[PDB]
Amino acid sequence: AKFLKAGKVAVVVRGRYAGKKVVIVKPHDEGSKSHPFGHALVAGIERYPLKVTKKHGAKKVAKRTKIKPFIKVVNYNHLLPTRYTLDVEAFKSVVSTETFEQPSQREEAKKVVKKAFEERHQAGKNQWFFSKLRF
Amino acid sequence: GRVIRNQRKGAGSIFTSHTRLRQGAAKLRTLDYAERHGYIRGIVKQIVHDSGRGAPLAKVVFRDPYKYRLREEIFIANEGVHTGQFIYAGKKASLNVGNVLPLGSVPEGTIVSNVEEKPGDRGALARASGNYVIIIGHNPDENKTRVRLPSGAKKVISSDARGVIGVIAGGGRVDKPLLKAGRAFHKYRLKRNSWPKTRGVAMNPVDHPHGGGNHQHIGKASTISRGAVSGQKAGLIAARRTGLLRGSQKT
Amino acid sequence: SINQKLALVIKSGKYTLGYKSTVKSLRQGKSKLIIIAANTPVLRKSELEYYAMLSKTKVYYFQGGNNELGTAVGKLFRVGVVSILEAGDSDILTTLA
Amino acid sequence: AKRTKKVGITGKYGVRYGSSLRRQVKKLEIQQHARYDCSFCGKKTVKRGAAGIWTCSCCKKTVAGGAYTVSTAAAATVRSTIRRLREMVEA
Amino acid sequence: SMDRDRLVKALNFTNRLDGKIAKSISRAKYIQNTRKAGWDSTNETIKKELAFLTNRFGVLPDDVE
Amino acid sequence: NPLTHSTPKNFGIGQAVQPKRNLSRYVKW
Amino acid sequence: AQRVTFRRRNPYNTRSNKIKVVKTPGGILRAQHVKKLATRPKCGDCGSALQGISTLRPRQYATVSKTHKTVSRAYGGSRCANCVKERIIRAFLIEEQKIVKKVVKEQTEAAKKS
RNA sequence: GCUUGUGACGGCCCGUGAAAAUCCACAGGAAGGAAUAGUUUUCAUGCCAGGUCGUACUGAUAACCGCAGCAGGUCUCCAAG
RNA sequence: GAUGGGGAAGCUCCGUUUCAAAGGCCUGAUUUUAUGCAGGCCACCAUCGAAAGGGAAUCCGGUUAAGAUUCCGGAACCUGG
Ligand SMILES: [Mg+2]
Ligand SMILES: [Mg+2]
Ligand SMILES: [Mg+2]
Ligand SMILES: [Mg+2]
Ligand SMILES: [Mg+2]
Ligand SMILES: [Mg+2]
Ligand SMILES: [Mg+2]
Ligand SMILES: [Mg+2]
Ligand SMILES: [Mg+2]
Ligand SMILES: [Mg+2]
Ligand SMILES: [Mg+2]
Ligand SMILES: [Mg+2]
Ligand SMILES: [Mg+2]
Ligand SMILES: [Mg+2]
Ligand SMILES: [Mg+2]
Ligand SMILES: [Mg+2]
Ligand SMILES: [Mg+2]
Ligand SMILES: [Mg+2]
Ligand SMILES: [Mg+2]
Ligand SMILES: [Mg+2]
Ligand SMILES: [Mg+2]
Ligand SMILES: [Mg+2]
Ligand SMILES: [Mg+2]
Ligand SMILES: [Mg+2]
Ligand SMILES: [Mg+2]
Ligand SMILES: [Mg+2]
Numbered sequence: 001a002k003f004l005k006a007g008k009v010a011v012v013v014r015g016r017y018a019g020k021k022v023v024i025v026k027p028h029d030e031g032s033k034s035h036p037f038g039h040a041l042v043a044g045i046e047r048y049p050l051k052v053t054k055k056h057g058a059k060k061v062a063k064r065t066k067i068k069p070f071i072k073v074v075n076y077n078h079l080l081p082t083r084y085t086l087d088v089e090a091f092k093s094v095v096s097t098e099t100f101e102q103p104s105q106r107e108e109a110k111k112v113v114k115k116a117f118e119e120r121h122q123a124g125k126n127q128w129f130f131s132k133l134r135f
Numbered sequence: 136g137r138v139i140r141n142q143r144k145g146a147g148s149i150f151t152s153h154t155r156l157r158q159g160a161a162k163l164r165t166l167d168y169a170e171r172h173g174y175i176r177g178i179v180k181q182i183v184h185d186s187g188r189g190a191p192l193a194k195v196v197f198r199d200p201y202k203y204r205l206r207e208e209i210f211i212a213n214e215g216v217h218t219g220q221f222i223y224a225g226k227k228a229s230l231n232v233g234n235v236l237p238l239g240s241v242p243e244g245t246i247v248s249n250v251e252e253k254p255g256d257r258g259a260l261a262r263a264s265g266n267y268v269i270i271i272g273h274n275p276d277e278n279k280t281r282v283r284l285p286s287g288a289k290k291v292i293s294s295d296a297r298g299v300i301g302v303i304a305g306g307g308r309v310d311k312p313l314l315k316a317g318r319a320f321h322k323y324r325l326k327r328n329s330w331p332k333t334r335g336v337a338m339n340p341v342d343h344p345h346g347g348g349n350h351q352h353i354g355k356a357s358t359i360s361r362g363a364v365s366g367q368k369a370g371l372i373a374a375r376r377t378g379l380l381r382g383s384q385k386t
Numbered sequence: 387s388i389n390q391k392l393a394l395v396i397k398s399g400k401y402t403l404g405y406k407s408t409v410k411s412l413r414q415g416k417s418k419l420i421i422i423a424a425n426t427p428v429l430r431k432s433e434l435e436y437y438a439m440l441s442k443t444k445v446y447y448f449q450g451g452n453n454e455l456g457t458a459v460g461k462l463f464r465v466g467v468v469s470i471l472e473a474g475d476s477d478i479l480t481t482l483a
Numbered sequence: 484a485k486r487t488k489k490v491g492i493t494g495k496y497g498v499r500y501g502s503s504l505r506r507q508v509k510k511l512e513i514q515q516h517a518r519y520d521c522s523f524c525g526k527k528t529v530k531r532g533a534a535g536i537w538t539c540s541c542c543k544k545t546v547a548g549g550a551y552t553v554s555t556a557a558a559a560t561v562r563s564t565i566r567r568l569r570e571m572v573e574a
Numbered sequence: 575s576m577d578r579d580r581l582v583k584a585l586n587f588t589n590r591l592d593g594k595i596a597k598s599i600s601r602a603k604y605i606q607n608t609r610k611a612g613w614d615s616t617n618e619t620i621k622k623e624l625a626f627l628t629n630r631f632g633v634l635p636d637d638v639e
Numbered sequence: 640n641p642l643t644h645s646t647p648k649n650f651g652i653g654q655a656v657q658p659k660r661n662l663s664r665y666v667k668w
Numbered sequence: 669a670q671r672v673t674f675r676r677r678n679p680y681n682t683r684s685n686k687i688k689v690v691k692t693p694g695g696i697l698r699a700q701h702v703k704k705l706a707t708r709p710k711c712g713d714c715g716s717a718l719q720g721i722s723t724l725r726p727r728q729y730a731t732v733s734k735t736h737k738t739v740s741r742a743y744g745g746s747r748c749a750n751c752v753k754e755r756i757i758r759a760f761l762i763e764e765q766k767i768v769k770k771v772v773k774e775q776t777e778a779a780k781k782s
Numbered sequence: 783g784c785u786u787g788u789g790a791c792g793g794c795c796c797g798u799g800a801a802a803a804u805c806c807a808c809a810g811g812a813a814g815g816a817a818u819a820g821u822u823u824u825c826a827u828g829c830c831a832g833g834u835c836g837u838a839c840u841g842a843u844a845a846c847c848g849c850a851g852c853a854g855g856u857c858u859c860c861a862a863g
Numbered sequence: 864g865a866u867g868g869g870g871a872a873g874c875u876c877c878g879u880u881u882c883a884a885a886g887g888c889c890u891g892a893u894u895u896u897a898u899g900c901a902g903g904c905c906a907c908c909a910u911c912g913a914a915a916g917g918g919a920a921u922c923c924g925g926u927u928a929a930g931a932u933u934c935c936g937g938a939a940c941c942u943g944g
Contacts, residue, residue, distance in 0.1 A: 011760055015741070018742055050811075053643060054643065080757060083636045086639075123641060124641040126639060135755045156799075168652075169652055181545075184798055191547055214547055215548075215558060215562065232565055242568050264550070286593055287589045287590050287591075288589050288593075301565070302561050304549070308550040312508055314504060318795085321795075375587070381602060386603045425525060429757065436761065439631040439632055452525045453525055506612075509616065513620055533798045534798095536798095630768055631768060633772055670860090670861095671859095671861055674860090676932090678914085680859080681915090684918090687859085701932095725918095726805045731824095732824080736824095743808060745807050
């Protein structure tokens with residue numbers, strides 16, 4: 001029915017992060033005074049991890065798996081929903097509507113999102129979320 | 136006398152073709168493993184006009200199967216194709232307009248164009264606008280297919296020769312009168328130096344077999360022998376008949 | 387026919403015409419049935435089908451172009467997709483279509 | 484009002500070339516300067532440029548067709564024949 | 575095989591001649607009845623020709639990890 | 640180990656670019 | 669008033685011999701040779717001019733910084749953003765149709781196994 | 783207003799109206815890398831160098847060609863009341 | 864218009880990528896140490912052909928008997944390092 005819920009993976013369609021995958025953290029179907037459209041507070045990844053084989057040593061393996069995150073407020077019209085999901089409860093209280101001012105707090109949210117995404121990229125969960133979309 | 140004009144046209148000095156604005160030679164893709172065993176898909180990017188040619192041209196781009204590269208071919212456009220369309224070529228392609236199939240893969244009555252005469256010469260038969268070849272039978276033994284050509288004649292081709300499904304775009308072109316010497320001028324300007332034409336009866340005996348004398352005439356019959364010696368072949372060359380082909384003057 | 391069912395739904399019911407309004411209704415889950423014209427582009431058609439898969443709504447493929455669909459819904463312009471928000475005296479949602 | 488009673492678009496030729504030749508050229512000129520429906524778009528926006536090429540101004544697509552008409556009757560019969568042959572061979 | 579050349583050439587000339595006679599009959603039938611029709615009939619036939627001339631994604635599971 | 644993932648190629652007839660093979664039978668000597 | 673001359677040695681009115689008339693600090697009229705105008709860059713698949721990119725003759729593109737030639741997006745100084753989002757939606761939906769194809773092929777084969 | 787440059791349109795074609803050097807961008811992810819540092823001279827400032835040949839004047843009822851300081855011939859730009 | 868080839872008694876003719884073993888970048892590795900192989904490339908085949916086509920970058924004021932977008936004074940820009 002109403003499917004754009006927290007934990008649903010989408011793809012950013014336009015606006016410097018076009019082509020990047022995204023987890024929805026907090027929906028807003030009505031929209032506040034700022035952002036009067038229906039929007040969603042989301043988190044995603046700007047720099048993807050590179051492929052790794054048996055040939056790489058431990059240092060180059062550790063280098064070729066770093067993950068650079070971002071957090072964003074984005075219109076519903078600029079998202080494209082998929083059928084995949086993710087568990088969002090790790091960085092759930094750190095991404096709020098007051099986080100997107102005072103950029104020290106944006107740095108603080110980005111560090112938690114970076115740690116959680118690297119932990120989930122370890123142990124082989126959500127390979128579709130951690131792969132790149134070729135377009 | 137002197138050397139006459141149709142003799143003069145073979146040294147090729149001012150009688151060569153005017154090829155500057157032409158897009159390239161229009162031929163099919165080179166036969167290889169993919170077309171020989173399966174099929175391959177390309178996409179038509181633009182349909183353009185070619186100078187000195189009634190039929191439009193299509194730019195279909197394929198992939199290189201041995202190198203990371205793209206390859207662009209120049210087809211003659213069949214009537215119905217559009218930009219953004221997929222073209223399939225090979226043995227296992229489907230019977231759709233625009234696809235390139237061998238002649239042994241089509242059923243009887245099929246309308247094809249740009250047909251190879253020998254398998255691998257990349258297109259010889261029915262290339263002008265509005266023309267087509269009709270498949271009129273097969274031979275599963277001896278690997279031969281019978282076709283009817285645009286002139287009415289019948290021919291037998293190997294079944295490994297390719298062809299494009301459909302009729303060539305630009306039909307009905309000669310249904311319009313030109314009305315003007317300037318229109319004829321601009322037509323032949325982009326083909327070759329062969330217009331206007333002086334009649335041979337209006338020349339002197341040094342210039343033509345039909346020249347000379349008061350009261351402009353051809354003195355003898357205008358049917359020449361087949362074994363004339365190339366300064367004499369002016370008229371009707373080896374005619375088996377003359378007349379009207381209609382016999383009534385009014386239909 | 388189906389034009390009589392569409393006309394009864396338009397006479398007594400709620401609807402919307404057009405791609406952006408249809409996608410908004412599919413987004414907040416208010417739609418019941420979408421009707422896609424035959425001559426719509428395949429990319430937009432496949433996106434509307436993926437949205438209908440995510441929102442669990444029914445799709446109907448109308449034979450005819452966007453201008454025949456506009457005449458069938460009773461407008462003097464062309465319509466690419468209809469979304470039926472509520473059906474009153476009609477039973478387009480409950481029938482075989 | 485009405486400026487020519489029966490000549491129309493062939494009034495640009497004056498008294499020249501012959502009456503029957505002007506009557507023959509009028510039909511093909513009307514057809515080649517007509518505007519046609521777009522199959523992919525729905526609008527009446529198709530125009531000719533460079534005979535054989537027919538371009539739509541909505542959706543920016545171009546189709547290969549006839550010299551003075553967007554599609555010829557021979558092409559229609561050939562498309563019907565190819566559909567019937569494909570359906571019978573696949574059946 | 576001494577007859578095959580002359581017989582194939584004879585059959586080819588007869589087939590070419592039949593095609594030529596057919597196309598000449600068709601072009602004369604087109605040119606007459608068009609050059610022999612006044613402006614009234616011309617405008618009428620011009621007006622006549624201007625007148626009449628499973629979502630699939632369903633078999634796909636949801637909320638997938 | 641679990642960061643590496645198997646992905647077999649489709650050398651097909653119209654799918655991927657063919658790999659380098661021994662073409663010594665077709666050398667223009 | 670007064671009349672002017674060409675300042676080079678080309679006496680002809682070609683596409684590269686274009687002059688304007690200026691008035692100088694000496695109070696006189698002089699011809700001034702102007703360079704050819706620039707064309708905007710175009711979309712690689714759309715056709716239309718690219719928003720944000722500066723317009724120059726092709727060798728003056730080496731004399732500027734990267735901000736004048738780029739837009740901060742994927743395919744930034746190359747595609748349209750409409751053409752870009754069309755590519756994104758096409759890629760995602762085609763890959764999902766390939767998944768659907770694999771699923772239904774498995775279903776046909778596991779039906780025909782019995 | 784006159785001459786000229788330019789923009790958005792429109793008409794015409796069985797006529798749809800050059801090529802190459804050259805420069806830039808994108809996709810890609812090789813390789814290098816931050817802690818006492820690597821990348822930047824695509825940000826700013828500072829330093830050095832830029833070879834060879836032509837360049838005067840006429841361009842015409844006297845500087846060119848017609849045997850001539852010949853009423854002939856010989857391409858083009860500017861343009862006041 | 865050479866070359867590789869093929870004609871011609873021969874002066875020479877055809878042909879311009881051809882039915883030829885047709886040539887370069889660099890990473891190498893770096894330490895007789897300087898540059899042999901490099902380990903990946905290499906599809907194109909010389910060259911000539913526009914002082915009106917294409918094309919990196921300059922303006923103002925002064926100055927001579929006769930020179931100047933070139934000299935002098937001031938103020939810029941482009942390429943290469
Ligand atoms: Mg030539
Ligand atoms: Mg004649
Ligand atoms: Mg005479
Ligand atoms: Mg005489
Ligand atoms: Mg004689
Ligand atoms: Mg005579
Ligand atoms: Mg007599
Ligand atoms: Mg020049
Ligand atoms: Mg910019
Ligand atoms: Mg800018
Ligand atoms: Mg002028
Ligand atoms: Mg650029
Ligand atoms: Mg000088
Ligand atoms: Mg001078
Ligand atoms: Mg002078
Ligand atoms: Mg003068
Ligand atoms: Mg003078
Ligand atoms: Mg004079
Ligand atoms: Mg003299
Ligand atoms: Mg004189
Ligand atoms: Mg030679
Ligand atoms: Mg040169
Ligand atoms: Mg020059
Ligand atoms: Mg030019
Ligand atoms: Mg002087
Ligand atoms: Mg100075």
